[PDB]
Symmetry: C4
Subunit: 254 residues, 4 copies
Amino acid sequence: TLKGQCIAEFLGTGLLIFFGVGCVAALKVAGASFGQWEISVIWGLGVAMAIYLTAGVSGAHLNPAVTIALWLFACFDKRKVIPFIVSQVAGAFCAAALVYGLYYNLFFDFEQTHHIVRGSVESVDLAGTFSTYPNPHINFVQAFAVEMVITAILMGLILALTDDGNGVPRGPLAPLLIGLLIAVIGASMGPLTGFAMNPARDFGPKVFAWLAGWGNVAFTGGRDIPYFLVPLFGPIVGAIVGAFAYRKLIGRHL
Amino acid sequence: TLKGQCIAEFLGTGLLIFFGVGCVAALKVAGASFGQWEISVIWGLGVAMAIYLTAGVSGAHLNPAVTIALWLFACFDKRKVIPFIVSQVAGAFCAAALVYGLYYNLFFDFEQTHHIVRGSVESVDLAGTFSTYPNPHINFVQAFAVEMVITAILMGLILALTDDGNGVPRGPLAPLLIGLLIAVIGASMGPLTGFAMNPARDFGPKVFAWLAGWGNVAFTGGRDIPYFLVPLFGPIVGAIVGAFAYRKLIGRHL
Amino acid sequence: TLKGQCIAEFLGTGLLIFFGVGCVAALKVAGASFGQWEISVIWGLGVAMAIYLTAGVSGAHLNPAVTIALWLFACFDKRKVIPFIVSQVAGAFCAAALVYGLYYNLFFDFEQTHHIVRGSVESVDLAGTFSTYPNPHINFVQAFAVEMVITAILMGLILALTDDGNGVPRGPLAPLLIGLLIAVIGASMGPLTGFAMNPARDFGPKVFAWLAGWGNVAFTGGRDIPYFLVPLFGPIVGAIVGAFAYRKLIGRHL
Amino acid sequence: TLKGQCIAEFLGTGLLIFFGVGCVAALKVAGASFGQWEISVIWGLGVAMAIYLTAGVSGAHLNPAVTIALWLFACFDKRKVIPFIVSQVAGAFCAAALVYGLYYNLFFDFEQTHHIVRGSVESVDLAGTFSTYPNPHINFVQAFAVEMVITAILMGLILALTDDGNGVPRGPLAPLLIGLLIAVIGASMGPLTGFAMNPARDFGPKVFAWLAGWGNVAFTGGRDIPYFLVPLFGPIVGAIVGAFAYRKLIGRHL
Ligand SMILES: CCCCCCCCO[C@@H]1O[C@H](CO)[C@@H](O)[C@H](O)[C@H]1O
Ligand SMILES: CCCCCCCCO[C@@H]1O[C@H](CO)[C@@H](O)[C@H](O)[C@H]1O
Ligand SMILES: CCCCCCCCO[C@@H]1O[C@H](CO)[C@@H](O)[C@H](O)[C@H]1O
Ligand SMILES: CCCCCCCCO[C@@H]1O[C@H](CO)[C@@H](O)[C@H](O)[C@H]1O
Ligand SMILES: CCCCCCCCO[C@@H]1O[C@H](CO)[C@@H](O)[C@H](O)[C@H]1O
Ligand SMILES: CCCCCCCCO[C@@H]1O[C@H](CO)[C@@H](O)[C@H](O)[C@H]1O
Ligand SMILES: CCCCCCCCO[C@@H]1O[C@H](CO)[C@@H](O)[C@H](O)[C@H]1O
Ligand SMILES: CCCCCCCCO[C@@H]1O[C@H](CO)[C@@H](O)[C@H](O)[C@H]1O
């Protein structure tokens, strides 16, 4: 039942953002030690749990990019596409609000101590707690390339790990492996654009940060071209490229 | 046989606290490098082993919050509720004493070096070695919200990961996954209240620290409202909310 | 079909180098915190994913040393040996180029800041981002011994973990375990020669670095005897020693 | 065949020490970043691989304490006890020599730089690279208690994780879990005595260090009572206590 699937997607995406934004809030305003890998493995495993929670019901897309790609290449009911995407974005939204709710004090005490004006260009660093931003040394197009490539790999391997005709089936191991995959993508490519590769994972929380006092920079990142467009469309394009790539170069030869 | 189940719960909870309090003693008085994630993964995996050890006998609750919730929502024998809870709290108690026994010297040598008066408000930091305390920037109610929310998630996902009607069954993977789940909750929400979410895990060891020279602050944490009430009731309320939430929003649609 | 297997090997090796060279680029020019173990576990797990992706098609050698050894001891079609090796080296090549493409800016901005002349003896450190080099305290022969021994162990355990007549079969766990194995070899022996143990993993990326401005030092490492010979032949010799060792000391007694 | 089992034990124990002593050599003389947990997880997983390699043949004791305990409580052929123990100690010996062989230069260059006289009381720190020593704040008896307790837990859980009548059988997961168990014991109790809990793991390598220039301190640790007695007998006593404890408190109720 579509209502029960939307609920699952809502919770799954929210669970996913709870752990992800959470560990990043601990790093930013709680002063917890975290390396590029640890942050990546936490996000990865968080997504793994999200999957174990909802796969049996919704099928666990938990990513607009994944939903659009499954529709175009895995015969996913198009009537289910928008309902899913609205659930995904809504859960990420609420989850971000929940993480902020619990860390509320640390955000303010940190900004006061370090004289950070929320909403200013310098507050993008803490805004990073919720959504992704581009590394200082790269521009809009370079950043678009990154999200595109990595999401392609994400989609491609998600299919590979779930393709029962490819090598020994993984069974209950599938979700976990999808987690570690996300982990390594986040550790190898993360420093460039924050390995968003999920429109819902980035837009929802960005909208939240926008309401919470970060204003326009939550969307622009303090740049000329509004950055939110990259985590929005880059993942979608790449998820399609990846899904196509698998069916052509690997599936076709199974 | 109830006596054999209580023994299992006693050992399981103790095993769990052995690893948990242990890695935190190494961090505090042994000077070992540990980040927020490592401390979390150790606790998580420690609980995973505890489960593998006792699941076959007691069913591995190892948490008063989990026992009360299983009683109210999983048809758990109420006659078994109190015997279990007393075993859980007793094992955590003894385990804490055991960890202190082995680290005895490091505690004293550390307090002498850093001129720390055990029992004083400043000794709460080392008391943290055994039980949980609230982050400096939050109060009693904020802290209650945290334990409540997270334990709800703990219970909810524990059911999800063990619900054989939800997606592919995890089989022998269940305990491990429950461990990583605990890991990510500890890494995303830990800095706020020490991710207690287990009345026995906190009260028992607090009682121990109280006897060992930490006195009243072991319970108060050096605050106006006695802090031990949060890890005591917050987890119980949340475990019920979580258990309810799963049966309603997910189980109902399986 | 050999064409589909070469494609799989190309992608597998490239996937493997994407994650590996990637996390090392983040460490070198992105300033991400990574310890010897984290770098090792990322490489390890990256190789694990590579396997899950191609095992069903090519058989997932993803290593010239492994291919030559399977030919000589596992009855691998010799007609398939060279096609495989050219695919492996080509994927590692392209993958390295891809990682450089995405990190392009960080490389230049880093070299400008730290006044590093690409191609100079001092730039070998960043060249390390792609291929392996010998620790300052050891020479050509010592370095050859290291790659030789470790690859022997790599091959030996790869066979052990996939030998269904050895203990309980691992099933879908095999790849993952091969990953952790690679992880521990990288953490225990890594600081000596960068745990290359894969001719394709080192030569391809070295050739890339050579074209990208590192010139001759990409091959020499800034030493008297051209270093590329060690990751080239050392792994091959060892993979044979390891494969032999297993069949003799372990397989023979199963 | 007993000869093939001794060979397996020899290699298994050696594999185990290769990874363990190796990561500790990287930490000491290679300057690699490693926290208490990482060192522990590497040892743990190293032992996990050792098991996967030999379980099918020898049964993978790889520990004199485990062999004596299996004999007394798991009906292990006593004729096989000494042959096993001599193999275990011999492999650990050779493995240590192998790790020193590969890290040879780093040991000398480090000692010269930091003006460390091998064999002196101050060189025990580097000797620690091979075997275990007691934390500065504890004595012989305190140290004996630690090894005793922890090995008991090691044995107890090894039985629990392999006891097919206890909860769902772990199957191919058993070795890995035994690894993480070792990991958490090393992270929670490691700083006290180096979590030896394996006579062969400590005596063999100590004998090696003794020959390599560390002399008498390799055995004494620079203390009044020769320290090697603790990792020698403490583990054996505890392994028996643990094995007994499981059969009584858990097995009896299955
Ligand atoms: C779940 C519904 C959440 C709705 C958005 C709540 C955002 C609360 O966030 C608040 O936003 C204010 C407006 O910028 C700021 O002034 C406050 O500092 C900030 O705490
Ligand atoms: C499902 C997601 C659909 C996103 C549609 C585009 C939303 C763009 O959002 C807009 O961005 C502007 C530029 O910074 C801001 O000025 C506006 O306040 C904001 O509403
Ligand atoms: C398993 C039974 C354990 C009973 C509690 C033992 C506590 C030992 O702890 C001791 O407590 C004393 C009283 O405050 C302090 O003076 C000592 O410093 C402390 O070591
Ligand atoms: C199963 C757990 C039941 C706990 C019941 C409440 C125990 C409260 O404990 C009490 O807290 C007081 C306040 O700091 C102290 O003054 C007392 O010494 C202490 O006994
Ligand atoms: C996939 C095909 C890739 C072909 C090699 C591209 C290498 C681009 O690398 C470029 O090499 C130049 C020559 O040294 C240097 O001057 C530039 O700094 C460097 O960016
Ligand atoms: C499949 C891999 C085959 C490798 C064959 C040897 C390639 C050696 O490569 C050569 O190394 C020389 C020494 O630095 C350089 O001067 C040359 O430019 C380079 O082409
Ligand atoms: C596998 C057989 C190994 C036998 C032991 C080899 C030990 C080599 O070790 C050597 O020992 C010498 C004697 O103390 C020292 O002088 C050297 O510094 C040391 O390198
Ligand atoms: C299977 C292991 C049996 C160990 C038997 C005891 C070996 C003790 O070893 C001895 O220790 C002495 C004290 O430091 C040294 O003086 C001797 O050189 C050394 O041989």
